[PDB]
Design a protein around this ligand. Structure first.
Ligand code: SFG
Lengths: 475, 16
């Protein structure tokens, strides 16, 4: 009964509205929330709207629908690949930099198109929809999915039925990620989504401006989990009709491309009011067409795109660093860092492809390890300005001594972080070799393996720099 | 490069 569901959702909104659980209680907060959510989901009837046909049965409808509104529909076909899922395959040879794909705005689903929808009145009367475009986009999806004569029906009928975002993982699958950096953003994702479902279920059932929405008596946890994972795995940012501010939008036909390594080749053209994509490389006929999604970490690919990309040259882990206010040299270091446009304490990144540290982190480590004399040579004199300009440059060291002390610092810091994981690198390679795992399980384990392999790379890199610059002191 | 790069699956904040 919907009276039992309204009781259960109030009980869920409460559990998700408390503060952070604490230090070593975040795994059990997530299991408690999981228990309540799974109870609700198993009393509901999955997706509220399902389609008679199979997914590929609606792609001609999508092509026909995109052709009539000006999109490119020639040169490619839809193929269900095992590895990436559905995607685009070239039916002809396509050269690098050729403009093969274009989608006018009239087809997109935007935040503003959600404001002009049957969702409109509720949107204008709800703080959270007004503040969160991605949620507003998500409810746009559900309201058009529930609309039998919707203009976007060819798009919605070709969207997946489920995803590999963590919102779909099992307990044992998320459990592999314990002690990682990644799992804290998986906890946030589950808590946030669960809170938003419990809040909006009450709104849809009782708000006077949601009364004649089609979602009224058909809004399951599954419905919302699918909507946000749809938005999360393929939403974009485009300019407005005029070009002043940016907005969030879903791009039909083009969002069907799968990711590979490379550069971004999809831009918006304000003049002709359309999204444009040039071929990132040469695609022979019969080869899959990929695009570069963006510079994103494996943590972000798994959590928000629902997959793990193996060849990811933009992989990174986070690292907290700052000058301790108990340093005798806090004031000078804080002024040098300020003059370099660098915060006193910040969250930096260790990287997978050399060099492990950006120009900003190297400049910080250099100031962090400077002596009083060196600090003065960057604060006073005619060369002080020119000396700060080169802090982030590997070819202009402050001293051999400074470099040795900062690579010694980095080597110890990554070594320390490595030990805070519950499994080792060798243990992870063993689990991948000797076990047989689901796709979602492989994601979790490859993710925690990746975090550690970056730390280990940083250790070795910092050690060889340490030894190179220590040989320079001896001469 | 491009005037308006379109990043597919751009990361947004979901914390309401
Ligand atoms: N390189 C890849 N490896 C594995 N899965 C991928 C890759 N690129 C994209 N995907 C999947 O495709 C989704 C992004 C989609 N917009 C692309 C079309 C999608 N494959 C579909 O069939 O609807 C991601 O959420 C992943 O589920």
């Amino acid at each position: 009964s919907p009276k039992e569901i309204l009781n259960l959702t109030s009980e869920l909104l409460q559990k998700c509205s408390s503060p952070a659980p604490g230090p070593g209680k975040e795994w059990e907060e997530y299991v408690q929330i999981r228990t309540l959510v799974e109870k609700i989901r198993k009393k509901q009837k999955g997706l509220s709207v399902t389609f008679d046909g199979k997914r590929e049965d609606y792609f001609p409808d999508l092509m026909k629908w995109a052709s009539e509104n000006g999109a490119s529909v020639e040169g490619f076909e839809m193929v269900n690949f095992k590895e990436e899922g559905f995607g685009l395959r070239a039916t002809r040879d396509i050269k690098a930099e050729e403009l093969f794909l274009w989608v006018p705005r009239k087809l997109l689903m935007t935040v503003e198109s959600a404001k002009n929808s049957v969702l409109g009145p509720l949107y204008s009367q709800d703080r959270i929809l007004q503040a969160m475009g991605n949620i507003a986009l998500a409810f746009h999806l559900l309201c058009e999915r529930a609309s039998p004569n919707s203009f976007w029906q060819p798009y919605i009928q070709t969207l997946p039925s489920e995803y590999d975002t963590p919102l779909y993982f099992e307990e044992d699958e998320v459990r592999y990620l314990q002690s990682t950096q990644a799992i804290h953003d998986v906890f946030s994702q589950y808590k946030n989504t669960a809170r938003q479902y419990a809040y909006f279920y009450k709104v849809i059932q009782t708000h006077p401006h949601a009364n004649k929405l089609p979602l009224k008596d058909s809004f399951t946890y599954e419905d919302y989990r699918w909507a946000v994972s749809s938005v999360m795995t393929r939403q974009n940012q485009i300019p407005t009709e005029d070009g002043s501010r940016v907005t969030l939008a879903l791009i039909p036909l083009w969002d069907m491309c799968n990711h590979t390594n490379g550069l971004i080749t999809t831009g918006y053209n304000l003049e002709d009011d359309r999204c444009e994509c040039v071929a990132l490389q040469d695609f022979r006929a019969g080869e899959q067409i990929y695009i570069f999604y963006g510079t994103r970490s494996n943590a972000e690919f798994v959590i928000h795109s629902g997959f793990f990309f193996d060849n990811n040259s933009h992989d990174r882990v986070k690292i907290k660093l700052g000058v301790s206010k108990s340093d005798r040299l806090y004031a000078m270091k804080a002024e040098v860092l300020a003059r370099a446009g660098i915060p006193t304490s910040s969250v930096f990144a260790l990287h997978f492809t050399e060099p492990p540290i950006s120009a900003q982190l190297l400049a910080f480590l250099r100031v962090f390890c400077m002596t009083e004399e060196e600090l003065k040579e960057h604060l006073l004199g005619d060369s002080a300005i020119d000396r700060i300009f080169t802090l982030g440059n590997s070819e202009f060291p402050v001293s051999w001594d400074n470099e040795v002390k900062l690579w010694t610092f980095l080597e110890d810091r990554a070594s320390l972080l490595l030990k805070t994981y519950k499994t080792t690198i060798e243990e992870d390679k063993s689990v991948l070799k000797n076990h047989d795992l689901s796709v979602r399980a492989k994601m979790a384990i490859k993710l925690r393996l990746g975090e550690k392999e970056i730390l280990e790379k940083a250790v070795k890199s910092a050690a060889v720099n340490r030894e190179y610059y220590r040989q320079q002191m001896e001469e | 490069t491009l005037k308006y790069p379109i990043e597919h699956g751009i990361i947004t904040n979901w914390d309401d």
